[PDB]
Structure 1
Amino acid sequence: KTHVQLSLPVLQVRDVLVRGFGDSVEEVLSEARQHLKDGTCGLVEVEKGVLPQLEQPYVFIKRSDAAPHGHVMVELVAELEGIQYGRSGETLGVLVPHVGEIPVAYRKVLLRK
């Protein structure tokens, strides 16, 4: 399927144990997609002071369209030293590995895969 319904656990930035997906734009997009498929991907909502507490390159989920079955359609955009790889809509948050942190909420998304 071109899209997959996922429910992403929303994590508090200070709880995150693994603060990024790797060391290059291509690696972080690769690893983010793998963790999204495996159910091992978390979401941190972006506010003041959040991104400096996480590791670059960043992987964002961004709104790709204006929401089937409650699932916002999203796609992946990476960022490294202020340059983004991909073009999309509003950020829903930054993706991180999930390794058992307790979430505060869930974010239903339809991931363009």
Structure 2
Amino acid sequence: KTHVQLSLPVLQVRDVLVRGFGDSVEEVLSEARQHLKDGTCGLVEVEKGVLPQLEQPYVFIKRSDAAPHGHVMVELVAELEGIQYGRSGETLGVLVPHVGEIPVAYRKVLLRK
């Protein structure tokens, strides 16, 4: 299917145990898309101070559409050393591995694969 429906845990920065998906722009996006599938993506909402506390490269989800059945459509946009690779809407969050952290909310997104 071109877009999957998911809802990801919103995890507070300081709890996140694995703080970025890898060490290139191709592999933070490979794992993002590979963790969205296996069920293990959570979400940190970028607020002042969050990004320095996470590792680059950063996978944001951002909105690609001005809400099927509740879920915001969104796409991934790596960033590393200021350059973004992709082009999308507003950031609904940064994407981390979820590995037992206890969420503070969920965020119904629909991810273009």
Measure how far apart 1:22 and its partner are: 0.2
What value does the CA root-mean-square deviation take over the aligned residues? 0.3
Q: Which runs of 5+ in 1 are unaligned?
A: none
Deviation at 1:67, TM superposition (A): 0.4
TM-score by length of 2: 0.99
Task: Give 1:31 deviation, angstroms.
Answer: 0.4
Q: How many residues are treated as equivalent by the alignment?
A: 113
CA-to-aligned-CA distance 1:3-39 (integer Å, 9 cap, x gap): 0000100000000000000000000000000000011
How far is the alpha carbon of 1:72 from its aligned partner? 0.2
After the TM superposition, which parts of structure 1 deviate over 2 Å for at least 4 consecutive aligned residues?
none
SS at match of 2:32: helix
CA distance in 1, matches of 2:23, 2:108: 28
CA distance in 1, matches of 2:63, 2:32: 16
SS in 1 for 2:35: helix
Deviation at 1:80, TM superposition (A): 0.2
What residue is the counterpart of 2:36 in the other structure? 36
State the match for 1:22 in structure 2.
22
The alignment partner of 2:62 has SS state of: strand
Structure 2: unaligned runs, 5 residues or longer:
none
* Paired-residue identity, %: 100
- Kindly indicate whether residue 89 of structure 2 is the aligned counterpart of residue 89 of structure 1: yes
